[PDB]
Structure 1
Amino acid sequence: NKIQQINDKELQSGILSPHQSWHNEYKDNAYIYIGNLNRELTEGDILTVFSEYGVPVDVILSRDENTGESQGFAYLKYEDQRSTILAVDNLNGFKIGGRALKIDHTFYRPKRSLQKYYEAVKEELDRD
C-alpha cells in the first residue's frame, strides 16, 4: 500500500513503459521480497501465486533456524526479469489468508548457513 500508492500517481501522469518508471532503477534485479505472508504458506504454495507473472528459477522462504517455521518473508527470482516489474506492481496489496502481502524489488545476498537449502530447493525447480 506504500508501493500501490505510487503506481496510481505514476500511471495517472501517463508514465507508461519502464524508462520513465521507477521500476527502471533496478533492471539488474530479479528476486522479489515477499512480505506479510501468512505463517502456514510454504515454498510450494508461494510457488503457486507467483507463476502467474513468470517462471521462477529460485525461491527462498525465511524461517527460524530452530523451530523451522515461516518468518513470513521470501525471496523469489523470476527467470525473465520483467516478471518482477509485473509481480511487484500488479500483485502488491493482495489478500491471502486475511493479510495483504507486500512485494518489492530486492538485491538478494545468499547466506552460507542455508547452502544445502539451495540445492534442496533448486533440485525441485531444476526438475522443470
Structure 2
Amino acid sequence: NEYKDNAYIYIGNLNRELTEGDILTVFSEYGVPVDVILSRDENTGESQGFAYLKYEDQRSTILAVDNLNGFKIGGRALKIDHTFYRPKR
C-alpha cells in the first residue's frame, strides 16, 4: 500500500540557518521529496528547530531517517523520526 502516510517524517534539531532548500537537496539523495514544511517562527524569522518533509516513496523515508538521524549538519545532530504529519494550508 503506497498511499499511506508513512511517506511523512519529522525532522528535529534543525539549525537556525537551515531552510527548505537545504533540506530538499539533502533529502533528495534519499529519494523524491514532494513537500517540505520548514517550521519557522514568525517572531524571529528563523527556523523553530524542526521541520517536515514527505516523500513520494515510503522507502525513501527510511533511507532518510536512518541515515540522517544522528548525522551532524551545521554542527548539530539531526533527529529524524517517522510520523504521520498532516499539513495545514
Task: Specify which structure has the higher proportion of strand.
Answer: 2
Residues 64-114 of structure 1 show CA distances to partners (whole Å, capped at 9, x for unaligned) of 1233210011110011111011111122110111111000001112235xx
Number of paired residues? 89
Task: Specify which structure has the higher proportion of helix.
Answer: 1
Q: Which moved more, 1:96-105 or 1:67-76?
A: 67-76
Gaps of 5+ in 1: 1-23, 113-128
Greater gyration radius: 1
Compared CA separation, residues 48 and 42, structure 1 to 2 (3 A) = same
TM-score scaled by structure 1? 0.62
Gaps of 5+ in 2: none
Aligned partners of 1:58 and 1:33: how far apart in 2?
Answer: 12
Aligned partners of 2:27 and 2:66: how far apart in 1?
Answer: 12
Compared CA separation, residues 90 and 25, structure 1 to 2 (3 A) = farther
**Which aligned segments of 4 or more residues in structure 1 are displaced greater than 6 angstroms?**
none
Q: Which has the higher contact order (CA 8 A, sep 6+)?
A: 2
Aligned partners of 1:26 and 1:93: how far apart in 2?
Answer: 28
